[PDB]
Design a protein around this ligand. Structure first.
Ligand code: PLP
Ligand code: PLP
Ligand code: CL
Lengths: 327, 329
């Protein structure tokens, strides 16, 4: 009996989740239906808003942190720190985020606009170095807690309680396959568990980068698909629930993102491109005719505008004429 | 089963426009008034203008004034109206041409091209008067071109009287003592106002303009930093007879307010939201507004304004920053 279109929210943390879903319209010329769950429509434009919500809300409820006193600490060069910052501002906690020096001014402003404290580590050390400084500050201060996004039990829990039930209602009980990229793995896992709760046997599909195919027989590498494919198996990912793995090149991911905008009005990030690519691969399978596939759009595209994802679109806008003496 | 975003699957992105959330302003409000913020920032391309694009396309199609694949939508705009018109072009299968001056950033031109809009750069020297003239030129050359016409169109206020107004009425359960909003085209103000008079609500209707360009108060058009409002003239769309009062807000008071909205309430938004909230808070201090409900609009999400004046001060802090030394393991 909280409805965002019908009611006034008490505060912005109440606007987390209950995200829309949209049929994939033009790009789908298969006989499968594809539902896109738009996590991009969360308040700070990331699925990670659900995770920050869970950490703060569940830690508070298990007496494990308190307003004014607690200090939330994380090493994150992505959206999790934005979301932690956001909920810090709303709920009255000091937040410290640790990240490599290579991060853009846009991604550091996003933290500091919410009052978070930054502490930067040298680029060559990367994320192992940030992880390092995070643990250092956490055990030095009696008031610090590490969020612990990759190992926390709050991660899959929140998706089993929110994202799952929502998709189930939104599709009215028709989900024949659920496809999602694995970052922390909480989205895939949390949703899968919900579907097993209600006796739905939808095929569960993980999506990984080709340039880092860790959930298969493959070694960690670099890839440009921000938010998924972290170079290991997360503790949070329940592997037994996963029926199938689909690898996507960065290139097939960027193509797909760019078409999503041009063809369907769905402005999103790299991970979204991968997920939809995977969805559409699955939809072309002959046994999937008349079935429903659900995937996730995890982030809105605006954060990724000055990145490889829209490099080709930035080619075409320079290479354009001014005009001079016409009126 | 009218459309509910939380419980339904939209047929396409245009069906997700409108039905935006509302949130009470909590920490920044040191008054005895309640302040409701209508979050137009939560539209699909993150501004209020998505409602206007929807209206133009949807009403023009229904009056036979345009046809898919045939008709070409044209507008001169260096702001969010262009993004919305682009978006709906992509979704509904129309060609869009946007004219703007050459001074526009690669970020703001990407946002258009990503939807396959056509761009036409006019010279920065001539600014917007120059873009406006090109747009009219293209429209008179091409029998299938249509000017979106954001400042003059009947569609603009209509959509706010049919959607924005009714939504606010349901969300506030009929408690609206004042509606305050910045005037770009004037359609949000006017459309909501008309709706409130339709249901017999006599809320005080408040326009907000930039202090440095106080045209609705008889000052002269001037420069200001408050993207979205203060066009430098009175739009035909604006019904001034419905407006009870005008409040001016400095660019600087608009920036401070937007920065606090983030820091203090988690509401990440642009300059015009800053202005609106500031104005709402000025009204809320009035003694006669004690225990009354003031509604305003957050028109756009903040991420588009990250490399602008709005967050310049915050970008100071993050560039002059320590790394830490040889001191990890
Ligand atoms: C976190 C993240 C995901 C993956 O979701 P998990 O909860 O980690 O499975 C996908 N892409 C982006 C953009 C992310 O921010
Ligand atoms: C256009 C717009 C407004 C003004 O709304 P109107 O309905 O056009 O008066 C305010 N701020 C921003 C950012 C907008 O894009
Ligand atoms: Cl006053």
């Amino acid at each position: 009996e909280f409805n965002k279109q019908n009611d006034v929210a008490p505060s912005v943390d109440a606007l987390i989740g209950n995200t829309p879903a949209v049929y994939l319209r033009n790009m789908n010329k298969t006989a499968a239906t594809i539902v896109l769950k738009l996590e991009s429509e969360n308040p700070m434009a990331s699925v990670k808003d659900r995770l920050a919500y869970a950490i703060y809300d569940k830690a508070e409820k298990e007496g494990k942190i308190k307003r004014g006193k607690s200090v939330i600490v994380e090493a994150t060069s992505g959206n999790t720190g934005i979301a932690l910052a956001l909920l810090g501002a709303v709920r009255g906690y000091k937040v410290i985020i640790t990240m490599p020096d290579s991060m853009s001014m846009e991604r550091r402003s996003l933290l500091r606009i919410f009052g978070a404290e930054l502490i930067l580590t040298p680029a060559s050390l990367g994320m192992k170095g940030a992880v390092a400084m995070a643990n250092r500050i956490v055990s030095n201060n009696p008031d610090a807690v590490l969020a612990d996004q990759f190992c926390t039990k709050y991660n899959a829990q929140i998706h089993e309680e929110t994202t799952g039930p929502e998709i189930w209602r939104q599709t009215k009980g028709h989900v024949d396959c659920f496809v999602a990229g694995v970052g922390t793995g909480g989205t895939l896992t949390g949703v899968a568990r919900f579907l097993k709760s209600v006796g739905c046997n939808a095929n569960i599909v993980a999506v990984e980068p080709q340039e880092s195919p860790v959930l298969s027989g493959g070694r960690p590498g670099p890839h440009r698909i921000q938010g998924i494919g972290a170079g290991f198996v997360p503790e949070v990912l329940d592997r037994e629930l996963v029926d199938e793995i689909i690898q996507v090149s960065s290139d097939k991911a960027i193509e797909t993102a760019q078409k999503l905008s041009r063809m369907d009005g769905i402005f999103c990030g790299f991970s979204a491109g991968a997920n939809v690519f995977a969805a559409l691969k699955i939809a072309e399978r002959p046994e999937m005719a008349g079935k429903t596939i659900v995937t996730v759009i995890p982030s809105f595209g605006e954060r990724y505008l000055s990145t490889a994802l829209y490099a080709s679109v930035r080619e075409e806008i320079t290479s354009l004429p001014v005009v001079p003496v016409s009126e």
